[PDB]
Amino acid sequence: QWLWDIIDEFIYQFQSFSQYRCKTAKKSEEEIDFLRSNPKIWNVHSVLNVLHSLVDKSNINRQLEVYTSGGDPESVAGEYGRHSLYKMLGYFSLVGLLRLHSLLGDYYQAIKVLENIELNKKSMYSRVPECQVTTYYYVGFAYLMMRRYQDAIRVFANILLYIQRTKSMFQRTTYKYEMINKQNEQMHALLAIALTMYPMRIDESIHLQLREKYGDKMLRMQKGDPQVYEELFSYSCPKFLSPVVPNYDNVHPNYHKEPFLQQLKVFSDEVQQQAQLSTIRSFLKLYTTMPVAKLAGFLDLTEQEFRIQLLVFKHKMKNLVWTSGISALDGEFQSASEVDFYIDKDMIHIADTKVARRYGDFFIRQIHKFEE
Amino acid sequence: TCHFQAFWQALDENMDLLEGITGFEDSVRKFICHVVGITYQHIDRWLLAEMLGDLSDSQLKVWMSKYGWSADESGQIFICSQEESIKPKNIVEKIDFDSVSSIMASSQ
Amino acid sequence: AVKQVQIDGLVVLKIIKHYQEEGQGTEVVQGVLLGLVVEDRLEITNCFPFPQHEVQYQMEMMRSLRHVNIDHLHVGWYQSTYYGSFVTRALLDSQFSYQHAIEESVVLIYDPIKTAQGSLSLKAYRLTPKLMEVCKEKDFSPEALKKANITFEYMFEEVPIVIKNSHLINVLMWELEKKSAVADKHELLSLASSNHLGKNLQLLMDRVDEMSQDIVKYNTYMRNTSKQQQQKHQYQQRRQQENMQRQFKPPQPPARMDSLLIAGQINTYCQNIKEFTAQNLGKLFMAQALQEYNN
């Protein structure tokens, strides 16, 4: 207990948000002039959705462990929000991509996200920095499971622009820069753990001491080890649903692990499937041009039971990606370049320091007129 | 992981819902003629129909007339050229006039 | 202040004439500048230079300029320097000498090598009033430095130059251009300079090593004071416990006008080598269009 007034204080406002803002608040003037003259804080409309997103995850784990079917904050977040957020005449505020990341976000607690190109299209307003960290991490983890892996370098590079120019000034992240920037580079490095070794997107971004901490992990992938499905799965384990708090822990019947067997046990068996491609990619190309004697020379050099090994060499070569045409007369395999890219961060680091040289001069030129 | 001896020759066909859906053979081989086009430039048609689940040449030429396959004989099969999938993301990638002129206007 | 500086044609060609004959290896050579300032525009029509060694030389020529009915009112003084480095205490001392007689005064610093590789470098800069402020009270002291605030953007403000002539010079420009040998203008688009870039950066590196020298001792001045403040507060707790039971020099810092002089000198490297940067990169990128059809 001690958390039941935490929901009940804020959901009494969240009851009103479907009531006021969808039904009647297109010509509502009297609540507006209360919010201009009385209070001291101006940013409550970004407080009132996003702190309500926090407090409902605090009570989804509470209610779903006390009521399975038709939970009450499953009702007030899920069954009230979505048509009430977008559909009305123009809410000329910062809520534009904010409300769809609730609408995609409540489409994301249950795993059924299929909608990436449709919400890409519909936006006419600008982006919030709180919006930008969640939306590449949401659709990139969607593409981590929906396996657009050659564009997964593009989605997780987009989040890592890293120019903060810090704005705190009263907790405006909220609580979520350092945790989620830890998150999005980790699955990015776990992309370099799963999809070995095509990025070359964390090598030019960050230092090499952190990349060797995963570097201990990714060399376990290659020939031999059973924990490589497990280190991929357990480091994603606070990232699948992210549950925050139980209020009642009674294990006689548990009645909280039945939603855990919903997501977690069936999500783990596909992490065994993730490093299977890494066992297809367990020969990095060191010998890539062969005769037909050295394809069968590759059949016995990889493993025993060499003839017929082509029934399991095709199992060793075909998971999503592998491209070479084989000859039968002269036996020529083909060779696909692992080729270097070149330094574009010399350009970007001019733009890193030129925004910093102007802004260190921008903020502190006010200082020369604040105190002198 | 492309196991087909279980799928076509060791399949337990006791359930009628496999024929209860229409065209399961034409759909799942449409998955399979798609995936072979990446991986071959020459394969014989004996080893082709073995991994396609034991249908004859009386139908093998019909399904290969659909999907851009020619039988260049004894035994090879024409999908595509050589030079597409060396795939250079090459060394010669460049910096253009307009890609740096954002910064070139302010230093000048 | 002065918002505009403007030239007649006679000042510049005699500015070349003290580079062209007089000193050739590298010489600081210097002059006076001349003109009247009609309101909001400093009009330059003349100069006469000084050899490499004064006011008696300067004032005797003033009668000579009056003898032929030519304008004789001293506004400022010019100086030739090396590649980017003109900023010294000696010219700024010799500039506030002329900021004091007339309220508007100028350096047009003529750099003959930046012209010979490229764009015209005369640097027509003027003194900011807040750097006029600190020398009139003569407090080169860090306590008034922050109240009479000097930070390095208003360390030398720049006055833009607009070229002016009579129309008979435009006759003589039209007269000369026809009757001449064909002097092709090709020397701007040169597309090899790495020692013009090299000595630009090497003269920068010794001043940042001079700047590294200044803040390494600035640790030691704090290492002098951080011991001595606690040692005297140890002597506070030493001597105050003494008189209950019965009943020195602080250091100077490095003198902070040189630390502002090095940042404004490194400010001269920063504007020019990055203006040098796209200058060569423009002729590199037009040469991308020169190889572009050739297979």
Side-chain angles (χ1 to χ4, degrees):
Chain A
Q1 216 146 38
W2 182 87
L3 278 81
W4 269 119
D5 206 356
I6 298 186
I7 160 162
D8 281 331
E9 181 191 6
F10 277 89
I11 292 292
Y12 194 30
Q13 301 188 332
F14 207 83
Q15 272 167 200
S16 296
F17 294 156
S18 203
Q19 283 170 309
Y20 299 167
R21 163 211 63 198
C22 198
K23 279 83 161 156
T24 184
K26 305 302 122 187
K27 38 172 298 190
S28 68
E29 56 92 20
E30 57 87 29
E31 199 146 69
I32 293 182
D33 50 67
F34 163 64
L35 265 300
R36 308 287 81 91
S37 77
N38 183 84
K40 62 188 184 298
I41 189 180
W42 303 276
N43 55 62
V44 289
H45 195 57
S46 87
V47 175
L48 279 168
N49 167 49
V50 189
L51 185 42
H52 273 101
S53 177
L54 305 189
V55 81
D56 208 301
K57 190 34 81 189
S58 188
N59 206 93
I60 279 170
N61 191 289
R62 287 182 256 170
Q63 189 78 248
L64 163 142
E65 79 171 354
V66 307
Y67 198 27
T68 305
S69 75
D72 183 48
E74 215 280 336
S75 159
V76 73
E79 296 178 350
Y80 273 3
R82 323 274 77 87
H83 275 249
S84 305
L85 255 46
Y86 171 65
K87 270 81 181 152
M88 319 77 76
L89 60 92
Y91 210 90
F92 59 111
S93 80
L94 51 91
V95 78
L97 262 184
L98 252 184
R99 68 193 150 198
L100 287 156
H101 300 342
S102 170
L103 200 148
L104 166 57
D106 292 307
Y107 209 42
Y108 174 77
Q109 321 275 347
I111 58 174
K112 196 254 206 168
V113 44
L114 211 44
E115 57 170 3
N116 57 68
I117 200 167
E118 66 152 330
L119 284 193
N120 226 338
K121 294 327 162 196
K122 54 179 299 299
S123 277
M124 62 299 291
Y125 313 128
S126 86
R127 193 177 293 274
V128 186
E130 184 268 345
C131 284
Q132 87 92 8
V133 195
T134 201
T135 179
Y136 291 133
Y137 183 60
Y138 278 179
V139 191
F141 182 60
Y143 295 158
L144 275 174
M145 295 312 296
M146 285 289 309
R147 290 180 51 181
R148 295 295 154 169
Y149 280 134
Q150 71 276 307
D151 280 326
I153 47 177
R154 326 293 165 88
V155 301
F156 273 163
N158 281 333
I159 183 171
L160 274 191
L161 165 58
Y162 71 83
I163 188 76
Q164 52 176 357
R165 312 307 307 175
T166 95
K167 312 290 192 198
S168 279
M169 321 185 209
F170 215 97
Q171 66 174 3
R172 287 310 96 171
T173 42
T174 170
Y175 301 162
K176 73 158 215 151
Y177 194 82
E178 322 273 359
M179 189 49 235
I180 307 192
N181 208 23
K182 163 60 216 187
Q183 285 159 195
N184 43 67
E185 67 206 333
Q186 209 270 344
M187 313 274 129
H188 196 243
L190 264 295
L191 187 81
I193 290 172
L195 209 83
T196 61
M197 281 181 183
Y198 271 172
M200 198 59 157
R201 296 300 212 265
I202 202 68
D203 256 7
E204 55 192 4
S205 74
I206 208 168
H207 308 278
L208 191 44
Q209 304 101 297
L210 175 57
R211 191 257 177 262
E212 288 292 329
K213 181 260 171 162
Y214 314 105
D216 193 26
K217 302 161 182 179
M218 51 190 81
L219 301 158
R220 306 195 295 254
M221 305 291 283
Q222 318 288 293
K223 305 306 173 186
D225 305 316
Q227 44 261 60
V228 311
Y229 320 110
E230 316 308 295
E231 66 93 19
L232 211 154
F233 168 67
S234 160
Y235 285 143
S236 280
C237 268
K239 328 282 183 93
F240 285 120
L241 195 42
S242 60
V244 291
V245 64
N247 77 290
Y248 282 155
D249 298 64
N250 42 0
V251 300
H252 52 300
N254 198 293
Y255 198 69
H256 187 211
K257 297 329 160 201
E258 202 274 314
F260 276 9
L261 57 91
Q262 284 193 8
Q263 282 91 21
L264 284 87
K265 178 55 212 94
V266 75
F267 259 70
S268 196
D269 203 67
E270 283 279 75
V271 193
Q272 265 83 22
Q273 191 273 324
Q274 299 303 106
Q276 199 148 358
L277 168 142
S278 304
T279 57
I280 306 276
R281 274 169 150 122
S282 171
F283 179 67
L284 292 91
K285 56 174 69 175
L286 204 162
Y287 185 79
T288 176
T289 291
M290 35 186 164
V292 73
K294 290 289 183 180
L295 157 71
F298 202 58
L299 253 51
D300 54 352
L301 195 152
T302 44
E303 274 106 320
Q304 297 331 288
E305 192 159 41
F306 61 96
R307 184 66 62 193
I308 298 299
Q309 206 260 330
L310 184 53
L311 192 145
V312 312
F313 193 69
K314 190 173 281 291
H315 300 348
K316 196 65 68 177
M317 79 189 260
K318 282 297 296 304
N319 204 258
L320 155 73
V321 214
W322 175 252
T323 164
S324 168
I326 63 174
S327 173
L329 317 182
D330 300 336
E332 307 164 352
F333 212 64
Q334 210 199 201
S335 316
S337 200
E338 303 316 298
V339 56
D340 199 66
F341 290 104
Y342 288 106
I343 172 63
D344 293 327
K345 313 298 175 187
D346 269 334
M347 207 290 261
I348 307 185
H349 274 67
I350 311 147
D352 283 307
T353 61
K354 255 164 187 296
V355 72
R357 155 154 176 84
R358 76 193 77 150
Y359 182 76
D361 275 25
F362 216 86
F363 184 74
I364 314 173
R365 254 46 193 181
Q366 199 265 356
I367 288 287
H368 312 148
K369 307 318 296 171
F370 189 86
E371 61 194 2
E372 283 171 13
Chain B
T1 324
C2 58
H3 298 68
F4 307 127
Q5 83 296 345
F7 192 38
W8 299 113
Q9 282 114 320
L11 209 66
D12 42 357
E13 301 266 0
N14 52 3
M15 189 156 96
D16 213 1
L17 308 175
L18 192 135
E19 278 323 294
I21 51 178
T22 69
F24 182 51
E25 186 174 32
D26 222 328
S27 49
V28 78
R29 290 185 205 224
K30 206 249 178 195
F31 152 65
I32 285 302
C33 58
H34 158 76
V35 303
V36 166
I38 299 172
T39 194
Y40 281 155
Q41 273 176 25
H42 309 312
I43 209 71
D44 319 304
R45 67 188 59 83
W46 331 110
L47 286 69
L48 169 70
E50 181 204 5
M51 68 91 71
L52 290 192
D54 73 12
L55 295 185
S56 163
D57 217 331
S58 48
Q59 44 263 40
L60 189 147
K61 285 181 205 304
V62 173
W63 290 65
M64 85 186 291
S65 59
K66 216 170 299 292
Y67 297 114
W69 272 338
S70 165
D72 298 2
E73 298 212 16
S74 288
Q76 318 163 329
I77 176 161
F78 188 61
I79 306 169
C80 77
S81 74
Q82 200 267 353
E83 296 94 5
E84 185 188 3
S85 276
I86 185 169
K87 52 185 66 173
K89 313 144 179 183
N90 225 27
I91 66 153
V92 72
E93 74 170 4
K94 80 172 308 289
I95 291 297
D96 307 67
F97 196 85
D98 48 0
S99 181
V100 282
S101 302
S102 314
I103 311 297
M104 286 167 64
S106 305
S107 300
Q108 178 88 352
Chain C
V2 272
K3 300 311 158 181
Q4 193 176 4
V5 162
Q6 44 162 122
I7 59 167
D8 210 4
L10 192 45
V11 62
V12 187
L13 221 50
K14 284 165 178 190
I15 272 170
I16 311 168
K17 206 37 79 170
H18 219 67
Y19 188 63
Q20 200 65 251
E21 298 283 312
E22 307 289 327
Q24 297 310 323
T26 297
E27 271 194 351
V28 49
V29 283
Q30 54 191 358
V32 302
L33 289 192
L34 265 304
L36 192 142
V37 188
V38 172
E39 69 277 337
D40 65 270
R41 39 184 54 247
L42 195 150
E43 311 198 296
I44 310 161
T45 56
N46 290 297
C47 53
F48 41 93
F50 274 53
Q52 175 57 37
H53 43 90
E54 192 265 328
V55 185
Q56 46 95 19
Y57 180 68
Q58 213 156 315
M59 278 304 119
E60 270 157 355
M61 206 70 71
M62 298 299 169
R63 83 198 173 189
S64 76
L65 207 50
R66 291 181 71 181
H67 282 297
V68 273
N69 310 139
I70 307 191
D71 56 327
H72 70 115
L73 203 73
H74 185 70
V75 293
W77 84 284
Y78 78 98
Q79 161 184 4
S80 193
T81 179
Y82 203 64
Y83 276 42
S85 292
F86 76 107
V87 172
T88 320
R89 187 175 170 89
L91 100 159
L92 176 65
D93 255 353
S94 160
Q95 172 72 17
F96 186 58
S97 315
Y98 310 143
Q99 298 288 124
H100 209 237
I102 168 64
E103 195 270 335
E104 52 201 3
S105 287
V106 69
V107 281
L108 266 74
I109 299 298
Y110 157 64
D111 221 315
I113 181 55
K114 203 175 177 161
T115 43
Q117 64 94 27
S119 89
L120 168 57
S121 179
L122 267 286
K123 308 175 272 286
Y125 282 67
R126 195 261 170 198
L127 202 65
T128 46
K130 301 185 186 70
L131 273 181
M132 193 184 180
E133 266 152 32
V134 73
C135 48
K136 193 261 181 182
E137 61 203 313
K138 202 59 178 317
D139 292 272
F140 278 126
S141 313
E143 67 279 5
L145 213 54
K146 318 295 168 93
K147 182 261 210 175
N149 214 42
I150 296 145
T151 323
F152 75 104
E153 65 166 356
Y154 37 83
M155 190 163 294
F156 289 112
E157 210 178 47
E158 179 181 1
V159 191
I161 316 100
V162 162
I163 68 176
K164 198 83 63 154
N165 293 80
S166 65
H167 268 279
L168 200 50
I169 313 161
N170 284 47
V171 170
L172 190 145
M173 186 54 69
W174 275 114
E175 181 258 352
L176 176 139
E177 211 161 331
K178 300 184 178 191
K179 299 285 204 311
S180 170
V182 179
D184 56 329
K185 36 185 93 76
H186 62 275
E187 188 39 41
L188 190 74
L189 73 181
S190 55
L191 76 143
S193 277
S194 172
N195 297 115
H196 198 86
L197 207 151
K199 273 318 278 191
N200 272 23
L201 209 149
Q202 192 66 68
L203 209 41
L204 162 64
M205 279 190 283
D206 52 69
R207 210 67 195 253
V208 183
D209 205 356
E210 168 60 64
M211 189 138 195
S212 157
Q213 192 36 249
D214 212 6
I215 59 189
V216 159
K217 298 189 156 231
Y218 172 73
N219 265 336
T220 310
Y221 163 68
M222 223 68 66
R223 283 179 60 186
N224 200 344
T225 53
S226 314
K227 299 182 192 212
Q228 202 201 108
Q229 169 66 258
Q230 184 158 354
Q231 211 174 70
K232 205 47 75 196
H233 271 176
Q234 283 233 4
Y235 188 76
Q236 200 275 338
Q237 70 190 353
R238 209 73 61 109
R239 193 178 175 270
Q240 281 283 344
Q241 72 188 352
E242 271 147 30
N243 51 5
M244 301 194 238
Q245 43 194 321
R246 299 160 182 170
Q247 61 98 51
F248 54 91
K249 172 66 62 182
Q252 187 180 0
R256 293 184 66 247
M257 200 46 246
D258 182 50
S259 304
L260 291 177
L261 277 175
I262 55 180
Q265 215 261 320
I266 291 154
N267 190 22
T268 68
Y269 295 110
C270 197
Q271 48 208 265
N272 291 346
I273 75 179
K274 299 175 76 187
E275 283 180 356
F276 198 34
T277 291
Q279 167 178 156
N280 310 117
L281 195 143
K283 291 128 193 186
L284 288 159
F285 265 99
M286 203 183 308
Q288 186 176 291
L290 262 295
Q291 213 65 245
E292 194 177 5
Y293 172 66
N294 213 25
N295 277 57

PDB file of all heavy atoms in Angstrom, chain C residues 260-273:
ATOM      1  N   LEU C 260      45.221  38.600 -21.918  1.00  0.00           N
ATOM      2  CA  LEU C 260      44.256  39.066 -22.904  1.00  0.00           C
ATOM      3  C   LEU C 260      44.918  39.316 -24.253  1.00  0.00           C
ATOM      4  O   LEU C 260      44.266  39.187 -25.294  1.00  0.00           O
ATOM      5  CB  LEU C 260      43.521  40.307 -22.398  1.00  0.00           C
ATOM      6  CG  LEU C 260      42.572  40.001 -21.228  1.00  0.00           C
ATOM      7  CD1 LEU C 260      41.914  41.265 -20.712  1.00  0.00           C
ATOM      8  CD2 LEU C 260      41.521  38.963 -21.607  1.00  0.00           C
ATOM      9  N   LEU C 261      46.211  39.670 -24.259  1.00  0.00           N
ATOM     10  CA  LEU C 261      46.911  39.896 -25.524  1.00  0.00           C
ATOM     11  C   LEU C 261      47.147  38.612 -26.307  1.00  0.00           C
ATOM     12  O   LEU C 261      47.219  38.649 -27.542  1.00  0.00           O
ATOM     13  CB  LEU C 261      48.252  40.588 -25.297  1.00  0.00           C
ATOM     14  CG  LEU C 261      48.304  42.096 -25.132  1.00  0.00           C
ATOM     15  CD1 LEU C 261      49.725  42.494 -24.798  1.00  0.00           C
ATOM     16  CD2 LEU C 261      47.849  42.742 -26.432  1.00  0.00           C
ATOM     17  N   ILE C 262      47.301  37.482 -25.620  1.00  0.00           N
ATOM     18  CA  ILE C 262      47.534  36.243 -26.347  1.00  0.00           C
ATOM     19  C   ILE C 262      46.243  35.725 -26.969  1.00  0.00           C
ATOM     20  O   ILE C 262      46.267  35.212 -28.089  1.00  0.00           O
ATOM     21  CB  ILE C 262      48.237  35.214 -25.439  1.00  0.00           C
ATOM     22  CG1 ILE C 262      47.465  34.983 -24.148  1.00  0.00           C
ATOM     23  CG2 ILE C 262      49.644  35.678 -25.119  1.00  0.00           C
ATOM     24  CD1 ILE C 262      48.085  34.000 -23.210  1.00  0.00           C
ATOM     25  N   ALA C 263      45.094  35.920 -26.303  1.00  0.00           N
ATOM     26  CA  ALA C 263      43.816  35.433 -26.823  1.00  0.00           C
ATOM     27  C   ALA C 263      43.365  36.243 -28.033  1.00  0.00           C
ATOM     28  O   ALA C 263      42.834  35.683 -28.996  1.00  0.00           O
ATOM     29  CB  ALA C 263      42.755  35.465 -25.723  1.00  0.00           C
ATOM     30  N   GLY C 264      43.591  37.556 -28.007  1.00  0.00           N
ATOM     31  CA  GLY C 264      43.349  38.372 -29.182  1.00  0.00           C
ATOM     32  C   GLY C 264      44.331  38.125 -30.308  1.00  0.00           C
ATOM     33  O   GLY C 264      44.014  38.374 -31.474  1.00  0.00           O
ATOM     34  N   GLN C 265      45.554  37.700 -29.982  1.00  0.00           N
ATOM     35  CA  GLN C 265      46.476  37.292 -31.037  1.00  0.00           C
ATOM     36  C   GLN C 265      46.068  35.957 -31.642  1.00  0.00           C
ATOM     37  O   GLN C 265      46.168  35.766 -32.859  1.00  0.00           O
ATOM     38  CB  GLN C 265      47.906  37.237 -30.515  1.00  0.00           C
ATOM     39  CG  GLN C 265      48.884  37.654 -31.586  1.00  0.00           C
ATOM     40  CD  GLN C 265      49.546  36.506 -32.286  1.00  0.00           C
ATOM     41  OE1 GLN C 265      49.907  35.527 -31.655  1.00  0.00           O
ATOM     42  NE2 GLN C 265      49.690  36.609 -33.603  1.00  0.00           N
ATOM     43  N   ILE C 266      45.604  35.019 -30.806  1.00  0.00           N
ATOM     44  CA  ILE C 266      45.088  33.737 -31.292  1.00  0.00           C
ATOM     45  C   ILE C 266      43.737  33.943 -31.982  1.00  0.00           C
ATOM     46  O   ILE C 266      43.357  33.181 -32.888  1.00  0.00           O
ATOM     47  CB  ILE C 266      45.088  32.734 -30.111  1.00  0.00           C
ATOM     48  CG1 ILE C 266      46.549  32.406 -29.749  1.00  0.00           C
ATOM     49  CG2 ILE C 266      44.409  31.399 -30.425  1.00  0.00           C
ATOM     50  CD1 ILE C 266      46.798  31.964 -28.311  1.00  0.00           C
ATOM     51  N   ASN C 267      43.046  35.035 -31.638  1.00  0.00           N
ATOM     52  CA  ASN C 267      41.901  35.501 -32.416  1.00  0.00           C
ATOM     53  C   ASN C 267      42.304  35.913 -33.836  1.00  0.00           C
ATOM     54  O   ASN C 267      41.498  35.777 -34.761  1.00  0.00           O
ATOM     55  CB  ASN C 267      41.211  36.658 -31.692  1.00  0.00           C
ATOM     56  CG  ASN C 267      39.883  37.029 -32.299  1.00  0.00           C
ATOM     57  OD1 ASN C 267      39.248  36.228 -32.981  1.00  0.00           O
ATOM     58  ND2 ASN C 267      39.453  38.258 -32.055  1.00  0.00           N
ATOM     59  N   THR C 268      43.534  36.411 -34.044  1.00  0.00           N
ATOM     60  CA  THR C 268      43.962  36.716 -35.415  1.00  0.00           C
ATOM     61  C   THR C 268      44.258  35.460 -36.222  1.00  0.00           C
ATOM     62  O   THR C 268      44.087  35.457 -37.446  1.00  0.00           O
ATOM     63  CB  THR C 268      45.178  37.631 -35.434  1.00  0.00           C
ATOM     64  OG1 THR C 268      46.319  36.928 -34.928  1.00  0.00           O
ATOM     65  CG2 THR C 268      44.909  38.866 -34.634  1.00  0.00           C
ATOM     66  N   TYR C 269      44.762  34.410 -35.573  1.00  0.00           N
ATOM     67  CA  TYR C 269      44.922  33.137 -36.267  1.00  0.00           C
ATOM     68  C   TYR C 269      43.578  32.512 -36.622  1.00  0.00           C
ATOM     69  O   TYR C 269      43.434  31.943 -37.706  1.00  0.00           O
ATOM     70  CB  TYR C 269      45.731  32.161 -35.427  1.00  0.00           C
ATOM     71  CG  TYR C 269      47.138  32.600 -35.199  1.00  0.00           C
ATOM     72  CD1 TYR C 269      47.529  33.012 -33.938  1.00  0.00           C
ATOM     73  CD2 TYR C 269      48.072  32.622 -36.231  1.00  0.00           C
ATOM     74  CE1 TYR C 269      48.790  33.407 -33.688  1.00  0.00           C
ATOM     75  CE2 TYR C 269      49.373  33.033 -35.990  1.00  0.00           C
ATOM     76  CZ  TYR C 269      49.716  33.434 -34.698  1.00  0.00           C
ATOM     77  OH  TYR C 269      50.978  33.860 -34.371  1.00  0.00           O
ATOM     78  N   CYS C 270      42.583  32.625 -35.729  1.00  0.00           N
ATOM     79  CA  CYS C 270      41.317  31.903 -35.898  1.00  0.00           C
ATOM     80  C   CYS C 270      40.477  32.444 -37.049  1.00  0.00           C
ATOM     81  O   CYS C 270      39.822  31.667 -37.755  1.00  0.00           O
ATOM     82  CB  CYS C 270      40.489  31.915 -34.620  1.00  0.00           C
ATOM     83  SG  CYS C 270      39.233  30.628 -34.723  1.00  0.00           S
ATOM     84  N   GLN C 271      40.444  33.764 -37.231  1.00  0.00           N
ATOM     85  CA  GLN C 271      39.671  34.304 -38.341  1.00  0.00           C
ATOM     86  C   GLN C 271      40.347  34.027 -39.680  1.00  0.00           C
ATOM     87  O   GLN C 271      39.667  33.728 -40.664  1.00  0.00           O
ATOM     88  CB  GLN C 271      39.433  35.803 -38.152  1.00  0.00           C
ATOM     89  CG  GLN C 271      40.666  36.595 -37.795  1.00  0.00           C
ATOM     90  CD  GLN C 271      40.358  37.836 -36.993  1.00  0.00           C
ATOM     91  OE1 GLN C 271      40.224  38.928 -37.544  1.00  0.00           O
ATOM     92  NE2 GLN C 271      40.229  37.671 -35.681  1.00  0.00           N
ATOM     93  N   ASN C 272      41.676  34.074 -39.734  1.00  0.00           N
ATOM     94  CA  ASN C 272      42.328  34.043 -41.033  1.00  0.00           C
ATOM     95  C   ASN C 272      42.522  32.628 -41.569  1.00  0.00           C
ATOM     96  O   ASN C 272      42.304  32.402 -42.763  1.00  0.00           O
ATOM     97  CB  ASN C 272      43.645  34.800 -40.962  1.00  0.00           C
ATOM     98  CG  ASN C 272      43.430  36.282 -40.786  1.00  0.00           C
ATOM     99  OD1 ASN C 272      42.317  36.774 -40.969  1.00  0.00           O
ATOM    100  ND2 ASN C 272      44.489  37.007 -40.431  1.00  0.00           N
ATOM    101  N   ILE C 273      42.906  31.662 -40.720  1.00  0.00           N
ATOM    102  CA  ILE C 273      43.181  30.311 -41.224  1.00  0.00           C
ATOM    103  C   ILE C 273      41.885  29.582 -41.562  1.00  0.00           C
ATOM    104  O   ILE C 273      41.894  28.621 -42.344  1.00  0.00           O
ATOM    105  CB  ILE C 273      44.063  29.481 -40.258  1.00  0.00           C
ATOM    106  CG1 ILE C 273      43.282  28.977 -39.033  1.00  0.00           C
ATOM    107  CG2 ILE C 273      45.334  30.251 -39.888  1.00  0.00           C
ATOM    108  CD1 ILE C 273      44.084  28.139 -38.086  1.00  0.00           C
TER     109      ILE C 273
END
